[PDB]
C-alpha cells in the first residue's frame, strides 16, 4: 500500500479538516485500503510555508495553500491575493484557470515540485475587533493581527491599522489577552476557532477572497499508479464541491449566528478601503516588471 | 482509524425450498472489533436487515422474516462471516450485503460495507 | 473421578433474540458423560432443556424449545453449548449445565453447574 | 413515574455499588418518588461491553464505563487508557473535557445512543501476584490475568507476562487455585474483591488510570422531562464528587492495610515499563491515521 | 508582575541530520531574574532536561544526550531564549518546553512553563 | 488586565489562606497573566462583616463568608448555623443547595451585590478551655470567647457559659492572659492559630458546622468577560475540592496531635447541648414569622 | 411498603370535636400498628395515639387521655382519631403513621403528608 501524509494549519472541527478527513475516508474506501491519508493538523508540522517547503524537498506529500500564497515562490502569483482585486471565488477560479494561472501552475510543478490538483473556496476574509469599526477612520491605531503574509500586512497597513504578524495558533490567546485589538479571517474560521467569544465586533470588509489549493508533491505524484492518480483526482474534486458549498452555505448563515451571540456587526463603507489600495497595485506591477493587476481584475 | 474492507461471495440462482450459504471475507482492521451483519435489498426498496452476530458469536440478531430459516455465524481465525439460508422462497430474491460496525445498531447505517452478491430464488 | 462444570454466556437479550451459552468442563474424562442443560424460572421447578450424547449422535430436547434451541458439544475443548434462538420472556431463567453418565429422566443429574442467568426482555 | 435500570459488573459492597445505591437514593429523594433507579449488579446482565450494547439498542438505561472503553466503538478513544500515557485522574479528566473529549462524547451519543453524564475516578491500576515483582524482569513468564480489554493485554504483553483474559467474576478463583499467578486492578477493588487474601505481593505499577463514566441511554434521556434531566445530571454529579472522592481516600490508606495483612508491597522501577510502551504509542498513531498520543500526553 | 508567561515557537517536521532553532518569548516578570531552561517530553515519560542558561548567559548547562549538538542562548533585550538544535535524530522527536526558574535546579521542577512546541524528526 | 482584591480574616499558614494563594496562582496561570488576585489576610481590611460591606459597595472584589453569616443581611439565613441543626457539611451543603438556599443566594446577589461562586467545608467547631469540660454542666462560669456572630453566642449562653464577644485577632492573647477561659473554633483553626499552646483542654462539642462561601462583588463580576468568569468559576471549584479535603483530612488527624501536646480531650455527652437549643429553635421560628428549623434539619 | 393519606383537617373551636381519618394503601393493613403523631410549630413530634393490629390494644398520650379516641377499620383500611374537648393547645399538623409494632424508643417506619388542625379561641 501507499500511505500519504497531509499537513495543515487548520485544527479539528474546522471545515478544512473535515474536508481532509472526508478525503482520507473516501481515498481509503475508493482504493479498498491501498491509499491511506495520514492527517497532521493544527500546524504541528509547521505553517503552510514550512509544509510547502517539505513538499518541495519530498518530506511531506500533501498540503493546503492559497493560489496567492504561491507568491512566496513565484512572485507574480501574489497578485491574485492583493486586497479586493478578486471579487468572488468564481473570479479567483478564472484567474486560476487563465493562461497566467496555468503558467504559475507549471512553474510550481517544475521549480518547486508542487502539483495543484484542485482549488476550493475557503471564504472571504472579514475583520473582528474589540471596538466597533463603522468607517475606515476607525482602523487608526487598531492592533490588528495578520498572518505572516505580505498582502494581509498590506491590507492592515493601508487600513490605517498597526499590523501584528503572528501564527494562527496564537491568535485566540491574544484576543483574550487583548494583546491585539482585532484579527482578520473568513467567517467560517471565526466560528470554528471561537474568535467570536473574544471579539465584540465584526466588520464585514470583504477585503480578500481565499481559495484553497490541494497540492501534492510531484515526486510523490509520479510514484503513484495511473489508477491511484485517478482515484485521488476524483476524490479531491468531489470533496472540493462539498467544501466550496459548505463555506458558501455557512457564510450565508453565520451572520445572524453572531448577532444572536450579541456580536456587533458593521457594514462599513468599502470605497475608502478600496481607494487605499490603488498605490499598492502600481507597486506590484512595477516590482514584477510586467503589469498584471489590471489584467487579473478584468478576468 | 483504519477501516474494514468486505467482499461477499456465494450469490447464485436457487430453487424454492433450496438452501444457500453466503460468505464474506473481511480485511483491514481487526475483525474481532466488529459486529458483523447481513443486509439485503430488492430493486428500489429500503435496506432490509436480515441478521447480525456479536464479536464473539454469543449474541445473534435476526429479522422476523428469516428468524427460523437463516443462520449467521462467524470465524475470527479466518476473518469471515457466513449466512446459511434455508427454505428460501422467491421473495428472498435480492442482493445480499455484508456489513460491519463496532456495535449492532438499528437507528443508522452500519459503518462499512461489501459489494453485494445477488441471490435469485426461482419459483 | 468427579467432574467440574462452569457456565458462561448469561445476558440481557430481547424478544426474538438469540443467545449462546457455553459450559466448560474439567476433571473426569469429558466424553464419559452425557451433557445436559437445565433451567429454572422463579416460581417453577428446574426444567429440562436439552441433552447430548457422548459423541453428539443423540440429542434430546424439551417440547418447549425443540425447534428453537440447539445443543452441541466439543470433546476437544471439553465444552457443551446451547444455542438459543427466538428467545421469549418465558425463557427467562437461570440456566444450568449438568453432567451424568447418560441421559436420565426419572432421577436427577449427578453433577451440576452453578448457573448463568438469562433475562429476555420484550 | 419512571423506573430506570442500571447494570454493572461491580458487586454489592464495592465502591461502585455504594455510589449507585446512593445515586438511587438521591434521585429517589430529590424527585419525590417520580424517578426510581433499579440496580442489576454483579454482571447479571452481561459484561460492560454487553451492557453498553444494550444501551445502544435501548434495552438497558444506565451503565458504567471507562472513557478508554469507548475505544470499542470510537477507536481514537482507546488512547486515553494506553498504559502510562495518562498520569492522574486530573490528567485523564482533562482529556474527557478537551475538544477531543467532547468530540468522542458527541460521537458516542449520535452513533451509539450513549450519554456520558459525568466521569468519576476509580483508581490507578496496580499489579498483584503470588510471587514478588521487584523489577521488570519479575514479570517474565508470569501468568497475569487481565480483563477483556486490549490495553490491559498490551500492558501485560509489553512488560513480559503471558496475559490470560478472564471475566471479572472468575478472578478470585483463578488466584486462589493459582490458575493465574497475578492480576491487575486498582486498590479499592483489590480489597473489596478480597484479592489480597489470595495474593502475596502488590506491585505498585501505576500502569493505567481508570475513570468511571456514568452513561445513560440517549433514547431513555429524551423520554425524561427537563426537570428530571437536571435532577439526574447534578445528582450524578453529587455522587460523582463523593465517589471520585472516596477512591482517593482509600488509595491513600489501603497500601498500609495490605501490609497489615502480610502483603509484600514492591515499588519496581517503572522506567523500563514506560520505555516498553514507545513502539505501542507510535503504532497507535499510525492505526488511527492521525497523532493523538502526543496531544493527549501533553494535556 | 509576580509570574512569567512563556510561548515557544519553532516546532517543525525535519529530517535526520537537519538543524532546527526553537525560540521562546517571555512576558510578565523581569526576564533577567530567571534562569531559562529547555525540557522535552515524549508520551508516557518524564520530561527530560535539555539545556539551561544563567541570568546573564555566563553559565550554560546541557544534557549528555545533546552535548555538542544543541546550543542554548538568550537575549535580555528582546526577552527571548533560543535553542539551536543540530544533527537531529528521530530520538530527538518530542514536545519541547520552555521553562523559567529563579535558579537552575535539578531536584525540582522549574516554576514556569509555556506549553511547548512539537519537534518531529523523520528517519 | 484585571487585578482583583481578596480580603480574609484568616492568617498566613491557614487553610483559608493557602487555598486563597492556590487560587491566586491558578488564576494567573490559567489566564496567562490576565487575572491577578491580590490577597489581604489577617483582617487588615476589617472583619468578615466589614469586608462583606466593602463588596456590597464595590470597594473590594472577593472575600470569604459562611452561608450562615448571611444572616447579617438575610435574617432567615442565620438558621443554617443555629447550633446543632446541621449535623455535618453534606447536610449544610444540601441546605445551600435546596430551594431555600437559592432564595437566599438570589437575595444576596440582588440586594447586596454578593455572588456566591461556591461554598467549601471549613470544619466543625469544638471548644477549648483552661479547665476540663466533661459535661455541659461544667461550662458554668466559664468565660467563653465567641465571635461577632449571634449563633456562636447563643451556643455559649445556653450551654451556660458567660459569652465574651471578641475579634478573631485578639483571641490568642485573651487566652494567654486568662482574660478568657476558653474559645470556640474548628480544629484546623485551633492549630493554625496555636490556641492549643494557651489552652490545656479540648472539648469535642461539635456544635456548629462551618462552611465558607467564596463571594465575588457583582459589580466586579459584571465587568469581566465570559471567559474570565469561566476561568474563575473553574478555579474556585477546584481549590474548594482540595480545601474541603484538607479540612476533612486534618480534622481526622488533629485529635491525636493535640494529645501529643498534652492536651486533655473530652468527648462530652451531646444530648444535653441539643436540649439547651430547643427553646432557641422555638424563638427563631417565631421571630422570623415562618417555620424553618424543622425544614433544614430534615434536608 | 405502606402509603398513608390523612383527611379531616379543619378550623374548629375550643371545646369542639373533630374526626380525622387516614387511608392506608399498599401492604396488608392488618399487619401494622397504626399511630397518630402531631407537631405544633417549633415543637417536636408528640405521640398522640396508637392502635394494635386488631384494635384490642390502644395507647394514648397523657395530654389527650380521656379526650381522644383512636379506632381502625381493617375492611376499609382506615384508622380514625376522634378528638373531643380540643382547645388551641391541640393546634398542630397531625400525622398518620404505621409500623409493624408499637414502638416508643424509635421513629415509626411509615408516615403521611399531614393534616392541619386549627383550634381558635
Ligand atoms: C493553507 C493555510 O495555511 N491557510 C491559512 C491562512 C494562510 O496562511 C494565509 O491566508 C496565506 O496567505 O491564514 C489563516 C490565518 O492565519 O488567519 C489561517 C489558514 O489556515
Ligand atoms: C465499568 C466496568 O465494568 N469496569 C470494569 C473494568 C473494565 O472492564 C476494564 O478496565 C476495561 O475498561 O475491568 C475490571 C476488571 O475486570 O479487572 C472490572 C471493572 O468493573
Ligand atoms: C469568613 C470568616 O471570617 N470566618 C471567621 C468566623 C466567622 O466570623 C464566624 O464563624 C461567624 O460567621 O469566625 C472565626 C472566629 O472568629 O473564631 C474566624 C473565621 O475566620
Author numbering:
A (entry chain U), D (entry chain K), F (entry chain G): 1 to 299
B (entry chain L), E (entry chain R): -1 to 121
C (entry chain B): 0 to 121
G (entry chain D): 1 to 121
List sentences quoted exactly from the publication behind this structure.
To check, whether this rearrangement is indeed key to the allosteric inhibition, we mutated the tryptophane to an alanine, with the intention to create more space and allow the structural transition in the presence of VHHVcP #2. To investigate the effect of the VcSiaP W73A mutant in detail, we crystallized it in complex with VHHVcP #2 and Neu5Ac. A diffraction dataset at 2.8 Å resolution was collected and the structure was solved by molecular replacement using the closed-state VcSiaP without Neu5Ac (PDB-ID: 7a5q15) and VHHVcP #2 as separate models. The C2 unit cell contained 24 protein chains and thus 12 VcSiaP/VHHVcP #2 complexes. For each of the 12 P-domains, strong difference electron density was observed at the sialic acid binding site. The difference density fitted sialic acid in all cases. A close-up of the interaction site immediately revealed that the W73A mutant had the intended effect. The surface pocket around position 73 of VcSiaP was enlarged and F101 of CDR 3 of the VHH occupies the pocket without restricting the conformational change of position 73 of VcSiaP and adjacent residues. Very interestingly, the W73A mutant had a stronger affinity towards Neu5Ac (KD = 76.9 nM) than the wild-type SBP (KD = 211 nM). Our observation that the VcSiaP W73A mutant in the allosteric pocket has a significantly higher affinity towards Neu5Ac than the wild type protein underlines the importance of this region for the open/closed transition of the SBP.
